[PDB]
Each structure stands twice: as structure tokens, then as C-alpha cells.
Design a protein around this ligand. Sequence first.
Ligand code: ADP
Lengths: 427, 53
Amino acid sequence: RIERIGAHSHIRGLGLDDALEPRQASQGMVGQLAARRAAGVVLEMIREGKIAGRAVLIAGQPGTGKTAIAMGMAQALGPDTPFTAIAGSEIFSLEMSKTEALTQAFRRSIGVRIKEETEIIEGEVVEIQIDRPAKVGKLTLKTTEMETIYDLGTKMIESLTKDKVQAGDVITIDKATGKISKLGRSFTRARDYDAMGSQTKFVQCPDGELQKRKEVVHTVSLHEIDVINSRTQGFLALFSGDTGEIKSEVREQINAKVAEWREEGKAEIIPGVLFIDEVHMLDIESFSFLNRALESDMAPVLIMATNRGITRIRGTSYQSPHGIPIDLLDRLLIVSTTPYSEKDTKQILRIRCEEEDVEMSEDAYTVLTRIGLETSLRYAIQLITAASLVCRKRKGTEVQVDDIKRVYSLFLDESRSTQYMKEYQDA
Amino acid sequence: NLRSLETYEADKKKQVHKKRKCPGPIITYHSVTVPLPPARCSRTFITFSDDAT
Ligand SMILES: Nc1ncnc2c1ncn2[C@@H]1O[C@H](COP(=O)(O)OP(=O)(O)O)[C@@H](O)[C@H]1O
């Protein structure tokens, strides 16, 4: 519950209507109807997943809400669909090539819902009488509507001895493997032992004696390749990034078995999204790889964001729009974000204030909207926070003009920093 | 009696056989629910066959 509000916490989805009509202000967003409708339609395409290898480029001036609309789409997509957010400079690893990192990122945003039929027996253990030779045992499971006694085997008795199960424990035994899983207790333990005090759990299902076809959908991403590349996979799946596995017999074989599962009804493919923020940092080799990697059937939807116009492509000398080669730039379609006006800026500032739980006068809102239209929006939020803190220190109830104007001089913007920078501190 | 014989064409006997096969010093861990749905609690018992154990 203790998680602080970040720069994109004010947004909590992409405000859209039944007909995908964008709204002025909803779900923490304001203005920018065109790019928001583009986000809505690409999100509909993602949730459809019928087509693979689609790319979208979010372009615009800084502070136009590129990362904002990206996080909004991520939120609107909701759980059950992977959304791999990554920065352009994260692919540069000292233990795995750029192409390998891109393959990892692509396969990481693809999920397979594996269906598994289970048969679990549950109930209340009324009698767990076990005859230890130092071989024979019987279990008396009880439910709210029926009871049954089961003769325990040697291995089952040993498993029960492993996980201590006293009378009155709510357990869920899997008839397939016999794994002992304790859920709780139905009553106290004799009220006499001067220890082991806990709370009592609710009774089990009436038909819990034998659940026939308990369906559990195990969801896992296509990053499962780490499970095969090495005999010990937890080390690679948890921390180790040195996963330069062999592409042959791993990628192709896993894809083939995933197709077999999809055809045989075991699992279903759920393509996610790969959001590369500041994609301009990718080397030209990474762009050349994305050009071809984006053509596979397992290719997720590649959302990208650029904050530049004509700029040199990293790893070469010639320039291209958005710092992306002409090929990949032409392949994808671009979503331009128009700057926000004064009203939109004021509304965004008000939404941020509401998020931060801070209140300020109308004149404060006006002067702060002015300052934000002049300097920037993020700087306006910084001033919101600073003025709220100055007001709290001042013992006031709401932020007045005298606090925003004070923190404006206390904290400087880059435009004024460079102005006072004429002291030639260093070069 | 004839009908009983013809229809006989027991698990308790197999349990008694298992007991026979037991060397004799068998310790049994036994816990049952006992009263203080109705209020109740769990009680634990550990039966020792012979004094050796
Ligand atoms: N539509 C918007 N609604 C609310 N805040 C926005 C919006 N657009 C930009 N911002 C704010 O501007 C700052 C930077 O803009 P951002 O959302 O990152 O877009 P960009 O990626 O173009 O900078 C962030 O602090 C963000 O909160």
C-alpha cells in the first residue's frame, strides 16, 4: 500500500467511449484527442491480437505526453496481457549481444495460457492415525455434507509426515502427485498446550472430498526458453543475464511446441506489447534487427517513442527523421502528439494537485498555468510540490500566490539556469 | 447357510495381516477432534506398543 505517486501516477487509463470517441478529461488525461484515439485503436488491435508484427511510433515535442500516453495504454490494457516497458539503452548488455537482448524483450511480452486438469481432494482431517514402525495409516477427510476414510500408503504416509498435518487442518491434497498443501485450521488444538495459538479458517466445500476436473490455467511468457538453455534455469530467470543460449533447437523448437499446444488445445497464445522509450538510443544494428524481427508470427506490438526530428542514427554518420533509419520508420506508422494549450495545461495541473492531495487558490492555479505554459509542464508539477511543501511549513491550508512565487525563485528552470550561467563556471 | 456360502464367492483380515507383519514395537501417532458447526478442538495421542520404545 505504501507506494509513492510518480510522474505518471495521475493517469490511470486511456479515457475512451463506446465508439472510441476521445473525451476532454477522463482517467487522468487531458486534451490530445488525436493521439489518444490512435492509442485507443492500437490498444483495440493489441487486445485483438489477430495480426502480428505491428509497430507504432509516438512522436512529438518534449512534454507532450508520449510516456504519459504510453503508461495510459499500459494501464488500459490491464493484467493478463504482458506489457514490457524498456528504455532504448537497456539492450546494451556486457553479457548478451544487442540482437539477443531484443529477442529476449520480444519473447518476454508474449504469453501462453497453459491449461492443466487437476484432481484435488480436500476436507477436514478428523483422523490421521498413522502407525510408524519405529507403514500403515488412514485419513478421515470430512466435509460439510459428506465424509470418507482413505487408506494411506507408505509414500503417502511419508509425505504426510513431512508436512505436519494435525487433526482439524484444512488441506488440499493433489491426487496426481500427492503434494501436501495446508490451508489452515478449523478449530484450536486442545486449549491446553501452552503454545501454537492461531486463527480458525472456514470449513471446506461440501463436495471437496473429490474435485474431479479442477481447471487451473498456468500463465507463462515465451521467456521460458531460459528453462531449457541451462540445466539450472532459476539462476538465469532470476538474476543472471548471461543467457547467450543457442538460437537453434531452442527458439524454433519452443515455437513449434507452442504451435502444437495451440493446435491440441493445451495452451493459447496472448501477444503483449513491447514499449521502447527513447528508441532513438538504439544502434543502427538494433534497428536493422527490428526491421526483420518484426516480421515473425510471434512478434508483439512494438510501440516506440521519439523526442527528436532530423538526427543522426547512432552507430553511423548519416541522419534520418526521428533518428530511425528510413526503412523501419517507413514500415511503422507514426502518431504525432500536438502540444497542450493553456486550458489543457491548467486542467493537467489541477489533476496533478488532486493526485498529490494538495489544494491551491484560483489565482495560484492561474499563475502556475502561466509559468507552466512558459517554462514546461513537468517543471510546473515540481513547483506544485515545492509550493505545497512551503505551505505545509508555513502552517497554511492551501497554496497561495505567495508560495508559488516564492518557490519559483527558490528553484530555477533550465531557461533561467542558463541565464545565470553566464559566469563561465566551466566549459 | 448355503446361500451365504454361495454368495461369499475381508479388508479387516488384511489389516490384521498387516498387524501380524508388524515386528511389534510400533508407535502410532493418532490425533482426533474432540469437543471443548459445534465448538470443538483437536487432541493428540501417541500409543506405544511395548515399554522398550
Ligand atoms: N496529457 C497529459 N496529461 C497529464 N500530464 C501530462 C500530459 N502530457 C504530458 N504530461 C506531463 O508532462 C511531463 C512530461 O510529459 P510526458 O507525459 O513524459 O510526455 P513526453 O514523453 O512527450 O515528455 C510529465 O511529467 C507528464 O506528467
